[PDB]
Structure formats: C-alpha cells, structure tokens
Scaffold this active site. Sequence first.
Site, PDB file in Angstrom:
ATOM      1  N   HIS A  90      -5.520  -0.502  -1.567  1.00 48.27           N
ATOM      2  CA  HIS A  90      -5.550  -1.949  -1.500  1.00 48.27           C
ATOM      3  C   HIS A  90      -4.215  -2.393  -0.893  1.00 48.27           C
ATOM      4  O   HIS A  90      -3.395  -1.562  -0.528  1.00 48.27           O
ATOM      5  CB  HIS A  90      -5.913  -2.641  -2.847  1.00 48.27           C
ATOM      6  CG  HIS A  90      -4.987  -2.505  -3.993  1.00 48.27           C
ATOM      7  ND1 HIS A  90      -4.863  -1.405  -4.799  1.00 48.27           N
ATOM      8  CD2 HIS A  90      -4.068  -3.413  -4.475  1.00 48.27           C
ATOM      9  CE1 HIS A  90      -3.930  -1.641  -5.733  1.00 48.27           C
ATOM     10  NE2 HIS A  90      -3.412  -2.849  -5.551  1.00 48.27           N
TER      11      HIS A  90
ATOM     12  N   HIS B 123      -1.551  -4.151  -2.022  1.00 52.46           N
ATOM     13  CA  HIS B 123      -0.330  -4.347  -2.799  1.00 52.46           C
ATOM     14  C   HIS B 123       0.733  -3.318  -2.400  1.00 52.46           C
ATOM     15  O   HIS B 123       0.435  -2.286  -1.825  1.00 52.46           O
ATOM     16  CB  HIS B 123      -0.595  -4.296  -4.298  1.00 52.46           C
ATOM     17  CG  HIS B 123      -1.260  -5.498  -4.824  1.00 52.46           C
ATOM     18  ND1 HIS B 123      -1.980  -5.455  -6.005  1.00 52.46           N
ATOM     19  CD2 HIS B 123      -1.393  -6.760  -4.292  1.00 52.46           C
ATOM     20  CE1 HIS B 123      -2.438  -6.702  -6.219  1.00 52.46           C
ATOM     21  NE2 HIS B 123      -2.151  -7.507  -5.199  1.00 52.46           N
TER      22      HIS B 123
ATOM     23  N   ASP C 270       2.518  -1.218  -4.051  1.00 52.58           N
ATOM     24  CA  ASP C 270       2.436   0.108  -4.609  1.00 52.58           C
ATOM     25  C   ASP C 270       1.480   1.014  -3.817  1.00 52.58           C
ATOM     26  O   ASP C 270       1.330   2.192  -4.136  1.00 52.58           O
ATOM     27  CB  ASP C 270       2.063   0.106  -6.093  1.00 52.58           C
ATOM     28  CG  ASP C 270       0.736  -0.536  -6.480  1.00 52.58           C
ATOM     29  OD1 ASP C 270       0.207  -1.365  -5.736  1.00 52.58           O
ATOM     30  OD2 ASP C 270       0.239  -0.144  -7.547  1.00 52.58           O
TER      31      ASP C 270
ATOM     32  N   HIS D 269      -9.793  -5.336  -9.171  1.00 49.83           N
ATOM     33  CA  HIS D 269      -8.368  -5.603  -9.228  1.00 49.83           C
ATOM     34  C   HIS D 269      -7.909  -6.482  -8.051  1.00 49.83           C
ATOM     35  O   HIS D 269      -6.982  -7.313  -8.174  1.00 49.83           O
ATOM     36  CB  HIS D 269      -7.588  -4.286  -9.264  1.00 49.83           C
ATOM     37  CG  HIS D 269      -6.133  -4.405  -8.991  1.00 49.83           C
ATOM     38  ND1 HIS D 269      -5.237  -4.693  -9.993  1.00 49.83           N
ATOM     39  CD2 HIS D 269      -5.382  -4.201  -7.870  1.00 49.83           C
ATOM     40  CE1 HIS D 269      -4.014  -4.702  -9.490  1.00 49.83           C
ATOM     41  NE2 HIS D 269      -4.070  -4.427  -8.208  1.00 49.83           N
TER      42      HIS D 269
ATOM     43  N   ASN E  57      -1.557  -6.905 -13.480  1.00 53.93           N
ATOM     44  CA  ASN E  57      -1.464  -7.914 -12.445  1.00 53.93           C
ATOM     45  C   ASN E  57      -2.863  -8.301 -12.020  1.00 53.93           C
ATOM     46  O   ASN E  57      -3.549  -7.471 -11.432  1.00 53.93           O
ATOM     47  CB  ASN E  57      -0.644  -7.387 -11.280  1.00 53.93           C
ATOM     48  CG  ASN E  57      -0.519  -8.338 -10.113  1.00 53.93           C
ATOM     49  OD1 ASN E  57      -0.900  -9.516 -10.176  1.00 53.93           O
ATOM     50  ND2 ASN E  57       0.087  -7.815  -9.057  1.00 53.93           N
TER      51      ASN E  57
HETATM   52 ZN   LIG Z   1      -2.512  -3.889  -7.012  1.00 49.72          ZN
HETATM   53 ZN   LIG Z   2      -1.188  -0.890  -8.780  1.00 56.77          ZN
END
Ligand SMILES: [Zn+2]
Ligand SMILES: [Zn+2]
Length: 231
Positions: free
Chosen positions: A83, A85, A87, A148, A179
């Site tokens: 995804h 993000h 990280d 998510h 989150n």
């Molecule tokens: Zn994420």
């Molecule tokens: Zn994550």
Amino acid sequence: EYPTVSEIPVGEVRLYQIADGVWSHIATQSFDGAVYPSNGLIVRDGDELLLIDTAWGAKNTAALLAEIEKQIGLPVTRAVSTHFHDDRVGGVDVLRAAGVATYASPSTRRLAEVEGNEIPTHSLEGLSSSGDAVRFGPVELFYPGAAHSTDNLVVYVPSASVLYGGCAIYELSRTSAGNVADADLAEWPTSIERIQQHYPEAQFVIPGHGLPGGLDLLKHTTNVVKAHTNR
Ligand SMILES: [Zn+2]
Ligand SMILES: [Zn+2]
C-alpha cells in the site's frame, strides 16, 4: 524467536525464515517517542529474490539490502509495495538507485503521489477490483478490497502456504485499531472474508506489524475493526 523492538537496534533489520525460500524482514521506526516494529517479506525466485515492501525508510531499506546480501546472497531484482504508506514505499528511492525494479498497483502509485511519498516505478495491472488476483513470480498478489487502505494488497506464497496480510491484518496482541486515517472501516471485514475465502489453506499469516500467527489473525482483525467501528 520472532524479533521484537527490544531486539532490533535503531536502523538495523532482522531476517526471519518462515519457511523454505520465504523470510520476513523486521525493522523499527520511532513515532512520537514510541517505537514500532514493521514487517515485509522476501521470497526466493530461483536464483533471485522478490522483496515485498520496504523496511520503512531509506536508512532501514539500505540496511535491509545489506543484510540480505550478507545472509542470503541472491540479488533482489523486484520489489512490490502493498500500500502507499511510508512503511511500504519509504525506501523505494534507495531500492531504485540500487537497480531494484519497484512495483505497485496504479491505485497505490496514485495515492503515494497524493501523500508526497516515494512512488514505485512500475504499475501492476489486474488488481483494480475486489477479489482480483495475479501471479508475480513466486507469489500471488490479491486485492481483497478496501481495508486498512483502499489500495491494500495481500501476498500469498503457494509453495510454502505463507499468507502475507500486510497492514490489512493485525497481530493478535493488537487489541485496538492502529492507523485508520486511510481505512475503509465499512468494507474491512468484507475484505478480510475475501482473504479467508481465497487462502483457507494458509499455514502462516504475517501481519504488517508484529508477530506471525495462523488464520486466526483474520477474525481477530475483524473483531478489532468492528469494535472500533462501534466506538
Ligand atoms: Zn499503512
Ligand atoms: Zn503498516
């Protein structure tokens, strides 16, 4: 046996062998004075490696590549970010500079651009609709639907029955939502059920953050998400 934050010095990465030809990578990042672990995946692809997700930042991702070459000694030729993000994409620039071909869905690439995050080079077709799957080397990539994040992918390694849920799947110790700024709470349990339907034989389930388990992590995540929904 699986490493936690307390076993990982700042800017280091650990590799954990899950099954033959399948490792997780574990790194840490400090956020608002607390320290969080994060997982990705490494899958052997003959005499090359496929990477799933960065190690959450440039320095960590450089450390990851150094640890792979020390411990495994096969070239990382491709990386997939699950995804948008940091990280997952933070460190894409490091990978690209190092000659790794970086991939994500067009959904992920667009959302990364909007966030001003690093953007994988290549676009992955065939993942735009809930329940879509494509094979990518030694793995299957699966778009379960929004959870998510709206773009979140999961990764299955059929040779080892390893399901990598990324941040759509919570570890068992996580009792409250993480989150959820970019989440679709409404669809998240439906999306988890698509995962269960598609990979009911999975023997290992790896969350985006924290300890691997089994398929129990899917219902676990559904419970947490529904509880948050009703907050
Ligand atoms: Zn994420
Ligand atoms: Zn994550």
